[PDB]
Structure 1
Amino acid sequence: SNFLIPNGTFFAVLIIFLIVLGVISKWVVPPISKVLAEREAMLAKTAADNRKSAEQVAAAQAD
C-alpha cells in the first residue's frame, strides 16, 4: 500500500549501482578511450604518411 513510500532498497540499489559504476570506470571507459585514441593516432599517421610519401617522391625527383 502506498508504494511511493521508499524503503530499504533505497540504499541497496545504490550499493549495487555503485559497484556497476566502478566496473565500467575500470575496464570499459578507460580501455575504450585508449582504443579511440589509438585509432585517431593511426588515422593521423596514415595521412602524414601519405603526405610524406608525396613529398619524398618529389624530393627524390629533385635529387
Structure 2
Amino acid sequence: NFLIPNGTFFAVLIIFLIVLGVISKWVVPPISKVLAER
C-alpha cells in the first residue's frame, strides 16, 4: 500500500522549489544574456 500519498509529497516540493530559484537566477538569466550577446 506504499502508493498512498505521503507527507513526503510536501517535503520534496520545497526542495524542487528552492532549486527553481537557482535556475531562475544563476542558470537561465546568464545563459540568456550570453546568447543575446553572441
TM-score bracket, normalised by the shorter chain, equals over 0.9
- Normalised to the residue count of structure 2, the TM-score between the two structures is 0.92
Q: Matched residue of 1:6: which SS?
A: coil
What are the ranges of 5 or more consecutive residues in structure 1 without an aligned counterpart?
Answer: 40-63
**RMSD in angstroms over aligned alpha carbons?**
0.5
Higher helix share: 1
| Superposition deviation, residue 32 in structure 1 | 0.3
What are the ranges of 5 or more consecutive residues in structure 2 without an aligned counterpart?
Answer: none
Larger Rg: 1
For 1:30 and 1:3, locate their aligned partners in 2 and report how far apart those are by CA, in whole Å: 40
Q: How many residues align?
A: 38
- Normalised to the residue count of structure 1, the TM-score between the two structures is 0.58
Q: State the 4+ residue runs in structure 1 displaced beyond 4 angstroms.
A: none
